[PDB]
Every structure is written in C-alpha cells, then in structure tokens.
Amino acid sequence: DDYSLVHKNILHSEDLLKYILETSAYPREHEQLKGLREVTEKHEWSMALVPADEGLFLSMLLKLMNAKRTIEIGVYTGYSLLTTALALPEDGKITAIDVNKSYYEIGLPFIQKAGVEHKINFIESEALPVLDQMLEEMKEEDLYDYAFVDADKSNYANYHERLVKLVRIGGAILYDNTLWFGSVAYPEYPGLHPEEEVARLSFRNLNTFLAADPRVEISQVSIGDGVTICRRLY
C-alpha cells in the first residue's frame, strides 16, 4: 500500500477507542449515519472518514452554540455533513463544498432518507474559488455560525484567511486532522508518502500560526485525529 499513517491512532490503544465508540457513540448515532458509515468503510478512501465519536462532538457543539447557517468544506461521503444537517433546526442551511461529487452521491440516499436534504446546498468545486466568491457577495447579515474544514490538507492556512471573514464574530471554525496521526509531534518524521509529509508540515505550521493568531481564540482537542476549534474575536 501507498499511505503510511492509515493504521495509526492518537489514542494509546485500539481497545480504548472501541470502548468509546461502542459505549457512547454508536448507541447515539442516527440510523442513517450508521448506514452511511458502514458503506463508507468499504470504500477505498475509508481512511478519511470522520469517526462516530468525533461526529457526536460536532453535533453537540452545533446544538450548544445554537448554530443555524454553516459551511462544510470537504464532504467525501457526507458523514460530517449528515451529522450537521441532523443537528441543525429544521430551517438550518448548509453550504457544502467538495471537488468530487461522486463521493457525495454515495451518501446522498442516507441524507435523503433522513429527510434533511432540503438544508443542503452542494457545490462541486475547489473550495478556494467558492470562498473568494462568497467574500464578494457576503452581507454582514448573512455570516456563517460554523465552519468545518476537512478538504485539502495543504490548503488549510489559505482557507483560514477567508473563513475569519466569512464566519460571524463569536462563530466557530473547526480544523480537522490537526494532529495528523500524531506525526506533527516531531520536526522530522520518517518514511511518509510525499502527500502525507506535505500535510504534516502544513499542520505543524498551521498549529503554530493558529496559536499566535489574535483574530481567534483556540482549543486543540485530541478527538479523532485532532480537531482545532477557533472562535472569532473581531
């Protein structure tokens, strides 16, 4: 095989991870999220799926902050998207962006059976051109409450420069995979696929920059593969 992090976890044992999933995540997972997850595990890019325990953490965060208008960048088969759509109120609206709609069509039957497709506006495109177009037309009355960032890893810093202007003051920007299977912990790290090493270097730089960015407050959370919550200050 070609990728060198796919079998790693940030937790010390797989048994602890399975405990969390079986005890607290799966019993609270919507039946369509379960169906979407199980077909995605068979897909060749299963490594990139947002896990069930992180998903319930995203749902909890969305409800506690009373989010209504959100943006999802990096959809894949739609697990975190369906998680968002189920957590928002019935009049919630999501802008969902991904370069590859074929992945989205794997999840769309489960989103449709859940009855939340009406909340979703899917845009098949590279993320940055869509974001830049939003900056041209965005009214302050239409800023987003919440952004989940999970698309091209090397492009997170570029995403951030747009998203600090597209989410409201007090809104949240979440960066997925910021611990990169634990490989960010070292300046040098051996044997990775070039794409994996670029992403690793990008995340070490992002984590540093985000801790120094006065436009936001942060909390890096050791759930899933690392999630960094940012809250816009001004």
Ligand X SMILES: Nc1ncnc2c1ncn2[C@@H]1O[C@H](CSCC[C@H](N)C(=O)O)[C@@H](O)[C@H]1O
Least spacing, CB of residue 204 vs ligand X, in Å: 20
Distance CA 146, CA 168 (A): 8
Residue 186 makes contact with a copy of itself by CB under 8 A? yes
For helices 52-64 and 79-87, the axis angle rounded to 10 degrees is 30
99 binds, among a copy of itself, ligand X, Mg ion, none (CB under 5 to 8 A by kind): ligand X
177 binds, among ligand X, a copy of itself, Mg ion, none (CB under 5 to 8 A by kind): Mg ion
221 binds, among a copy of itself, ligand X, Mg ion, none (CB under 5 to 8 A by kind): a copy of itself
Within positions 139 to 178, which residues make up the interface with ligand X, using CB under 6 A?
150-152, 155
Least spacing, CB of residue 133 vs a copy of itself, in Å: 28
Is residue 152 within 8 Å of 127, Cβ to Cβ? yes
The contact mask relative to a copy of itself for 36-75 (x = CB under 8 A, - = no) is -----------------x--xx-xxx-xxxx---------
Q: Taking the mean position of all CA atoms in its chain, how far away is CA 205? A: 19
Residue 180 makes contact with ligand X by CB under 6 A? no
Distance CA 49, CA 70 (A): 20
The only residue of 176, 199, 210, 228 in contact with Mg ion, by rule CB under 5 A? 176
Handedness of CA 166, 167, 168, 170 (dihedral sign): negative
- DSSP conformation class of 25: I
Q: How many C-beta atoms lie closer than 10 Å to residue 124's C-beta?
A: 14
98 binds, among ligand X, a copy of itself, Mg ion, none (CB under 5 to 8 A by kind): ligand X
Q: How many C-beta atoms lie closer than 10 Å to residue 143's C-beta?
A: 16
Burial class (CB in 10 A: 0-12, 13-18, 19+), 155: middle
> Which residues of this protein are in contact with a copy of itself, per CB under 8 A?
9-13, 15-20, 23-25, 27-28, 53, 56-57, 59-61, 63-66, 170, 172, 179, 182, 184-186, 207-208, 210-212, 217-223, 228-229, 231
